[PDB]
Write a protein that binds this ligand. Structure first.
Ligand SMILES: [Mg+2]
Ligand SMILES: [Mg+2]
Ligand SMILES: [Mg+2]
Lengths: 49, 49, 834
RNA sequence: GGCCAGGUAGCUCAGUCGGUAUGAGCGUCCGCCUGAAAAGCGGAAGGUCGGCGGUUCGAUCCCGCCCCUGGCC
């Protein structure tokens, strides 16, 4: 739920993978791991990353 | 440095050409001895891993 | 970028309109702001001062000459019949100015006692203070010059400067742009303290000005995303007028410098209401004002005198001559108010938050206006903020407000900026908070934040106010009730988690490998994913080496380290150099982390709509676009492997120590590995082993190449090991030993092989020939004497034969030994010693 | 983003705006010494003075660009 072109995402300075506009980066948090778990595992989910 | 200012140009030009020849002979000899070392490292220092 | 500085006196003033007599301590105010969600970065009290600190007027100036820097012997009027003679080194004042004087006996922050001094052959009966010395601001190049009429000579300095005030430095979250003003923060405090709020932007506080016709011809292109654009002129301002001290002070305490009344009013109202304002010199506007996108390669010189390269996504304000402003970022130098400006056209516009964010980030202009528009500005107070600016400027600059007004509110014109209504159950905040709030708590709190709530039985219909575009879903409303009711009332109950499976086999093995290496003498480090500069050129790797195919970071902290690690060795060797270079010469390091090994060029995947679940094929596509990131274990060794002591001088690190590190990782993984000679940089080609699990290669180990050691500044004899844990399958063996009660037979066999034959190949041949009777085999002698022959070595193995159901004879064991001897002669060409 | 300050031996730091950094403290090495050590005394080695170019007979020093920290807003 990060809005594009917004201080809630633009100010989040991230190590982006070259070249520019590659939509690939070094994760600023392990929250994407929590996204993968909800997509792969069945409910309920109690996970630690 | 202690030589007169009128003589530093002529003498300094002959000093550099002399030390550049010695530096030239040293650089290629260093590469030759390093190449022989890299070529004679496998057999002269081989072990039963 | 999210900083909001404002004095408590101004904050209290706005709250006190609807709550007369409201006054809290700075400590309680800090806790209330934190308790409702506003981080207080700093609480800075002004001053304090004590003793004779008063307002003075410079009546005469004598330029004391003969020194390095100009010194002034000033006669200052402090309100009595005897002018004080004060020496000063500042040059930012003239005769007739109002200054702040610290007389002998006064105390300045902090602990600086003022007394009569003898400087430059003169008698200084006091001191003219600067903004920094009074703890009022950061200005220290000159002294503080109050504007004319701020105070009479002799007034108390602390009272005129308001040194009893407290400045609050807040860090506003990007979801609460409405709190980047005194208006929003006062509303928040009114909600927190259950007070009646009088909106400083309402018509009661800002009575509307006449609307008798258009103020300026305007053509707005709606594709630029502008929601509102208002214009009102102020004519006949006095160029010699200066802002009153109460206005310049509040700007200073908010972090803005005063310049001229026209600009001071726009900044002041921006801080008060949250709507950024700009003043254009109307006499320098040439024709119809146009709001459009910038064309390709178009440039514009902003009011700071710097030429800006614009983009087609930038919204511009232009006339017939040149660009007037960069929409929502900063105005241009063409229509900039100057010292001779007499007629001013005030601009009140609401720009697209996303467009302003992209423009201010591409041009690196995080202005006070930009960082407010990108967080959405209330589009309903544009005319209110405009009329507030006009009436204030006309009052202080002696001007006259023009009754004309241009107010473009869209096509068709929007007369109601209400966001869409939200339907939510009355008990939804109670369920998410786990607290049974009192009756009507949700409706009351949602009405406090400015929303209109209607009851439809058990369901609420909430319409948020125009200044709260963050409230779109019921969850957004739940946060408003929970934060105003206090998160401390939420109880602490443990969730009903189901029965779990614990650690996976891979997670369990990673612990065992770490324990075994630590107990074996290795020290764990955290390897950095960023590779050192030119480390592969130091290793001498070929141009097509797979380790060179790295993933690069666009914006690294160090520009010479952009590539991500394909191997864990460079980080270990860098940590090895740090330890050795600091007196720790005998060290063994290890690390367990992932590497980044891409298989193609950096290829991205387009934006998947987040309104649904990505399909399994789209999830597989996102995984295929990422580089391979397997788990690696690696270690490096240098110096003494075994330290010296009463037993002896110790043993230096050798390649066998790195080979043993492999067997430690193998035993910890419960897998069987084999080591084979290999030539693989940066290892020594004659002292390098390739580790295999069955027939799959999992890594290498041994001593590093001597040339790599020289070029890298490593200690001599440095050894290293690296294994790919993902290439090692997780094993779960179930042994079933049969302990034989019958005695064993001990025999030794000495075999002569070529020097290049590995000792394990001989042992494997002996086991293959000995059969099931062989219980144990162990090498204990490697003899290379002259009676053996050149390039030949003798190996002696200790054999232990034992039958599971009988007692063997010496011939029975010798028969198995002879069969083992023949197997070695056939597979490794062994010859029985003799 | 401008203007300053800086990057110097293995570590922590001095010092030079053209031909030797007569570099310091500790670290490394040698001798006397000890059974073997260390200290002490007497001595040596090691920097290509941040990187790439340029000016010059010759650059740690002057010029340009870039990388990395500090001060400054
Ligand atoms: Mg919220
Ligand atoms: Mg250093
Ligand atoms: Mg000694």
């Amino acid at each position: 739920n990060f809005p594009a072109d917004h201080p809630a995402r633009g100010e989040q300075d991230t190590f982006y993978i070259a070249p520019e506009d590659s939509r690939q980066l070094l994760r600023t948090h392990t929250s994407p791991v929590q996204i993968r778990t909800l997509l792969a595992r069945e409910l309920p989910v109690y996970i630690i990353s | 440095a202690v030589l007169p200012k009128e003589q530093r140009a002529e003498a300094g030009k002959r000093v550099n050409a002399a030390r550049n020849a010695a530096q030239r002979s040293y650089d290629e000899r260093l590469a030759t001895l390093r190449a022989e070392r890299d070529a004679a490292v496998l057999v002269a220092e081989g072990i039963d891993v | 970028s999210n900083a909001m500085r404002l004095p408590y006196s101004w904050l209290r003033e706005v709250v006190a309109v609807g709550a007369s007599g409201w006054d809290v301590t700075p400590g309680e105010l800090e806790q209330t702001l934190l308790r409702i969600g506003h981080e207080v970065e700093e609480v800075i009290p002004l001053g304090p001062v004590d003793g004779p600190v008063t307002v003075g007027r410079v009546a005469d100036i004598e330029e004391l000459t003969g020194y390095k820097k100009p010194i002034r012997a000033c006669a200052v009027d402090i309100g009595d019949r005897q002018y004080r003679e004060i020496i000063c080194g500042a040059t930012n004042f003239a005769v007739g100015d109002l200054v702040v004087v610290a007389l002998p006996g006064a105390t300045l922050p902090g602990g600086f006692t003022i007394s009569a001094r003898k400087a430059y052959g003169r008698n200084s009966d006091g001191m003219i203070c600067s903004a920094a010395e009074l703890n009022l601001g950061a200005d220290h190049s000159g002294i503080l010059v109050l504007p004319p009429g701020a105070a009479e000579p002799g007034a108390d300095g602390a009272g005129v400067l308001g040194l009893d005030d407290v400045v609050f430095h807040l860090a506003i979250t990007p979801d609460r742009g409405y709190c980047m003003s005194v208006r929003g923060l006062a509303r928040e405090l009114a909600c927190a303290y259950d007070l009646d709020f009088v909106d400083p932007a309402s018509n009661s506080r800002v009575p509307p000005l006449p609307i008798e016709g258009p103020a300026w011809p305007l053509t707005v292109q709606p594709e630029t995303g502008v929601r509102r654009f208002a214009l009102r002129p102020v004519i006949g301002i006095d160029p010699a007028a200066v802002s009153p001290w109460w206005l310049q002070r509040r700007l200073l305490l908010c972090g803005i410098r005063a310049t001229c009344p026209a600009v001071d009013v726009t900044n002041y109202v921006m801080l008060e209401l949250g709507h950024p304002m700009h003043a254009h010199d109307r006499n320098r506007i040439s024709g119809t004002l146009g709001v459009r996108f910038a064309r390709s390669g178009e440039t514009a010189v902003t009011l700071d005198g710097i030429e800006r390269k614009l983009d087609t996504a930038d919204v511009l304000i232009v006339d017939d001559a040149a660009t007037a402003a960069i929409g929502g970022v900063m105005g241009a130098a063409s229509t900039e108010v100057r010292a001779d400006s007499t007629d001013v056209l005030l601009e009140a516009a609401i720009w697209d938050p996303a467009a302003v964010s992209r423009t201010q980030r591409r041009l690196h202009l995080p202005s006070e206006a930009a960082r407010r528009y990108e967080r959405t500005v209330d589009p309903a107070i544009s005319v209110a903020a405009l009329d507030r600016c006009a009436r204030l400027l006309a009052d202080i600059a002696g001007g006259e407000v023009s009754p004309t007004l241009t107010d473009w509110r869209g096509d068709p014109p929007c007369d109601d900026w209400s966001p869409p209504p939200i339907r939510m159950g009355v008990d939804v905040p109670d369920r998410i908070a786990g607290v049974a709030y009192p009756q009507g708590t949700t409706a009351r709190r949602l009405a406090q934040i400015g929303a209109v709530v209607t009851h439809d039985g058990d369901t609420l219909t909430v319409t948020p106010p125009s200044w709260r575009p963050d409230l779109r879903q019921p969850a957004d409303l739940v946060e408003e009730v929970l934060r105003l009711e206090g998160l401390e009332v939420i109880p602490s109950v443990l969730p009903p988690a189901p029965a779990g499976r614990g650690l996976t086999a891979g997670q369990q093995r990673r612990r065992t490998i770490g324990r075994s290496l630590a107990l074996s003498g290795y020290v764990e480090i955290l390897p950095t994913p960023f590779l050192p500069a030119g480390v592969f050129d130091l290793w001498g790797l070929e141009a097509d080496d797979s380790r060179r195919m790295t993933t690069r970071v666009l914006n690294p902290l160090e520009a010479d380290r952009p590539q991500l690690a394909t191997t864990l060795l460079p980080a270990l060797l860098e940590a090895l150099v740090r330890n050795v270079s600091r007196g720790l010469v005998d060290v063994a390091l290890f690390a367990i982390a992932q590497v980044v090994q891409p298989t193609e060029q950096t290829r991205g995947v387009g934006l998947i709509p987040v309104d649904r679940r990505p399909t399994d094929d789209e999830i597989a596509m996102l995984d295929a676009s990422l580089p391979r990131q397997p788990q690696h274990v690696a270690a490096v060794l240098a110096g003494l492997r075994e330290p010296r002591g009463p037993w002896g001088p110790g043993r230096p690190v050798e390649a066998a120590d790195a080979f043993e590190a492999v067997r430690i990782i193998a035993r910890a993984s419960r897998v069987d590995v084999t080591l084979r000679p290999a030539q693989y940089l940066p290892w020594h080609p004659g002292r390098c082993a390739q580790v295999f699990v069955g027939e799959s290669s999992v890594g290498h180990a041994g001593q590093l190449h001597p040339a790599v050691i020289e070029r890298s500044g490593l200690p001599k004899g440095t050894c290293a090991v690296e294994l790919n844990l993902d290439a090692i399958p997780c094993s779960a063996p179930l042994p079933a030993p049969r302990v034989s009660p019958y005695p064993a037979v001990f025999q030794d066999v000495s075999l002569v092989v070529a020097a290049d034959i590995p000792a394990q190949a001989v042992a494997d041949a002996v086991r293959a020939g000995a059969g099931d009777l062989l219980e144990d085999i162990a090498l204990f002698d490697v003899f290379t004497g002259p009676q053996i022959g050149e390039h030949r070595k003798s190996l002696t193995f200790a054999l232990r034969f034992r039958a599971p159901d009988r007692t063997l004879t010496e011939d029975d064991a010798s028969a198995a030994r002879d069969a083992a001897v023949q197997s070695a002669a056939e597979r490794v060409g062994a010859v029985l010693r003799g």
